[PDB]
Design a protein around this ligand. Structure first.
Ligand SMILES: *[C@@H]1O[C@H](CO)[C@@H](O)[C@H](O)[C@H]1NC(C)=O
Ligand SMILES: *[C@@H]1O[C@H](CO)[C@@H](O)[C@H](O)[C@H]1NC(C)=O
Ligand SMILES: *[C@@H]1O[C@H](CO)[C@@H](O)[C@H](O)[C@H]1NC(C)=O
Ligand SMILES: *[C@@H]1O[C@H](CO)[C@@H](O)[C@H](O)[C@H]1NC(C)=O
Lengths: 376, 262
């Protein structure tokens, strides 16, 4: 005598495309008496079973990024009612080789600012970047900087020592796989030296930066310029940047670890040289996905009694709530008062028995809590 | 869709046709205008040109030129134009130093240190300049020459000041108010008219050109502001910061066309 309870609710799955398993598993193990029946959704449409389903879990033979990558959800039902799972993403993590195996020789003038473009191949998963210069890691400093967002190598002011071969090294942070691009041979063009000029901020952080609680948020800023620009980070409001923040040696990346509310607000990067100044500005806005503070628990109640049920979640922006009964949205009606994360039933009847879900959500995430109302 | 092109190099003007086939047309711009070959038209009327520009008007370094996005209503009619034309933007062409040749058009072989162009569309026939471009509709263009002068032309002050604020590719700035009329020659009486094209890819042959005969003055000091502009260029997997200089298209053959002269 019990409605469905999640034993193994769908979790995010990272499948390495060049794995050796011709199969991936999406879990949906549920316990009830009677034993629940289970169905699967993908991108909001039903999975009409090379798909297999064992003990509620969706088994895919021959996974294929194209047909299989997406957002899954399961729904479990027995005679006592229905619950819906959280969403789970199935992700294929991969990194292709660079296609073209050949770079044209490029020529730049002494004193000139330039960017060597990585042009990373098709991939899925977060990438990190390094360059190789004449067979040795390319040294970074105030004059040379590698972006971890673009993977580009920025050279503020080219000097004679920069002549040689450059290869971009790209690493998929999920599979730990590395790929090398074709070397781009670079030479001095023997016209003049480049004259002097204002810094040009060539890579920078966005005007608006969502900054997730607890994570490390990374801001970039680097400029081309002759003389080589200085890069300065500050908060517009004059408060000191937190000491926990880390600066890249070229000063081109500010990293704010364990991001918290007080770390938010407007940041500025100032690039300056003897010829002028430019500034990149952006607002970091703190956010947090919802977290359960109070869930609903099973209720056993008798006819004509009343019922008050409440769930509570934190998050930023502050979560709103909505209710499901047996998977369908439940709103205020006769006998049943639904107000944010609360449900009030004045006089219980037999028809009220069912599965209920209290849902908490903001822009950034949705969470579910589930319980059974049973009547006697 | 929008092929890379530049004012020199492997993607320079001689090579535009390789990716933008209309640049190879026979009704191309710009041209040298030989006065003795131009034939001899309602009067040119300007509307709105004397009004002060609004604070919303702004300037952008596009990498090819410095552009002024006009936010007020300026209209031109007459001079053989079919109906009324409204101004969309202004763009500039210049040399390298010391008042070197920077114009696109010339008159009797005479080039000028700068050429300013104003681009127009018929606002009644079409709801925007970009649609006009899309449909290869007729668009209007005025070409105004600048000529070296011993002292600063105060009328150019807000434009020169703006140039100082957009040294690099992609920089933008608002401008101090200016009188569009005062960037045109003192005498509007003498001008030439012909049918030609955009002087940049895609080189569409949809342009009614109004080339004013008399130049507007500019000092060597003011010119320095144009020469101080930078752009960026591409080579295989490299982007570079370069002087923006000599940003003009070479001249093209008249072919079957005649120039009219007011
Ligand atoms: C994925 O599907 C495409 C066509 O939809 C197919 O060409 C490709 O081989 C598949 N990829 C893998 C790794 O099975
Ligand atoms: C599901 O939606 C995502 C985009 O949100 C898309 O990337 C993916 O290819 C979709 N999967 C299917 C099955 O079409
Ligand atoms: C750099 O490497 C290229 C091949 O990638 C080679 O042709 C060239 O000689 C190297 N540069 C020098 C001058 O050693
Ligand atoms: C609904 O439940 C709340 C419990 O917080 C109670 O105070 C309220 O009186 C109930 N509403 C009705 C209509 O009885």
């Amino acid at each position: 005598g019990s409605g469905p309870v999640f034993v193994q609710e769908p979790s995010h799955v990272m499948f390495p495309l060049d794995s050796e398993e011709k199969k991936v598993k999406l879990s949906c193990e549920v316990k009830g008496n009677p034993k629940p029946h289970i169905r699967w959704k993908l991108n909001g449409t039903d999975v009409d079973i090379r798909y297999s389903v064992v003990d509620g879990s969706l088994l895919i033979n021959n996974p294929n990024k194209t047909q299989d990558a997406g957002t899954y959800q399961c729904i479990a039902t027995n005679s006592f009612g229905t619950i819906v799972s959280r969403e789970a993403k199935l992700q294929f993590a991969y990194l292709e080789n660079f296609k073209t195996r050949t770079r044209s020789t490029v020529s730049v003038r002494r004193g000139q600012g330039m960017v060597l473009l990585c042009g990373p191949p098709p991939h899925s998963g977060e990438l990190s970047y390094a360059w190789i210069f004449n067979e040795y890691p390319s040294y970074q400093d105030n004059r040379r900087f590698v972006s971890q967002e673009t993977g580009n190598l920025y050279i503020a002011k080219v000097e004679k020592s920069d002549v040689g071969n450059y290869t971009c090294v790209v690493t998929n942070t999920v599979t730990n796989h590395k790929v090398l691009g074709p070397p781009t041979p670079l030479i001095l063009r023997n016209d003049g030296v480049m004259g002097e000029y204002e810094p040009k901020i060539e890579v920078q952080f966005p005007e608006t930066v969502p900054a997730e609680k607890g994570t490390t948020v990374k801001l970039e800023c680097f400029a081309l310029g002759n003389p080589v620009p200085t890069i300065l980070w500050r908060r517009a409001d004059g408060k000191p940047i937190a000491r926990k923040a880390r600066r890249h040696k070229s000063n081109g990346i500010l990293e704010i670890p364990n991001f918290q509310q007080e770390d938010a607000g407007s940041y500025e990067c100032v690039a300056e040289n003897s010829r002028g100044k430019n500034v990149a500005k952006g607002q970091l806005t703190f956010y947090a996905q919802p977290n359960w503070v109070q869930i609903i628990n099973d209720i056993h109640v008798a006819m004509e009694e009343s019922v008050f049920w409440e769930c509570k979640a934190n998050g930023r922006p502050k979560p709103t709530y909505r209710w499901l009964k047996n998977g369908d949205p439940l709103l205020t009606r006769d006998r049943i008062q639904i107000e944010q994360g609360t449900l009030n039933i004045t006089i219980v009847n037999l028809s009220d028995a069912g599965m209920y879900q209290c849902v908490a959500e903001n822009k950034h995430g949705v969470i579910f809590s589930s319980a059974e109302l049973s009547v006697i | 869709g929008d092929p890379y092109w530049a004012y020199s190099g492997a993607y320079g003007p001689e090579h535009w046709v390789t990716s933008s086939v209309s640049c190879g047309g026979s009704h191309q711009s710009p041209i040298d205008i030989l006065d003795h070959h131009a034939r001899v038209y309602q009067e040119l009327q300007l509307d709105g040109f004397d009004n002060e520009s609004s604070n919303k008007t702004w300037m952008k370094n596009t990498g090819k030129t410095v552009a002024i996005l006009l936010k007020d209503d300026y209209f031109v009619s007459g001079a053989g134009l079919p109906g009324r034309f409204k101004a969309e933007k202004v763009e500039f062409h210049w040399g390298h130093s010391n008042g070197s040749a920077g114009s696109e058009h010339s008159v009797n072989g005479r080039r000028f240190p700068v050429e300013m162009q104003i681009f127009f569309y018929n606002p009644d026939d079409f709801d925007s300049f970009q649609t006009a471009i899309s449909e290869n509709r007729i668009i209007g263009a005025m070409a105004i020459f600048f000529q070296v002068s011993p002292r600063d032309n105060s009328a150019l002050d807000p434009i020169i000041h703006g140039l100082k604020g957009v040294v690099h590719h992609e920089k933008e700035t608002f401008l101090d108010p200016f009188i569009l009329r005062d960037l045109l020659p003192a005498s509007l009486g003498s001008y030439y008219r012909y049918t030609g094209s955009l002087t940049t890819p895609p080189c569409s042959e949809i342009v009614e050109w109004i080339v004013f005969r008399r130049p507007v003055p500019i000092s060597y000091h003011q010119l320095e502001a144009f020469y101080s502009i930078f752009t960026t260029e591409q080579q295989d997997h490299v982007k570079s910061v370069e002087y923006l200089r000599n940003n003009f298209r070479p001249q093209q053959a008249l072919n079957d066309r005649v120039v009219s002269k007011s």
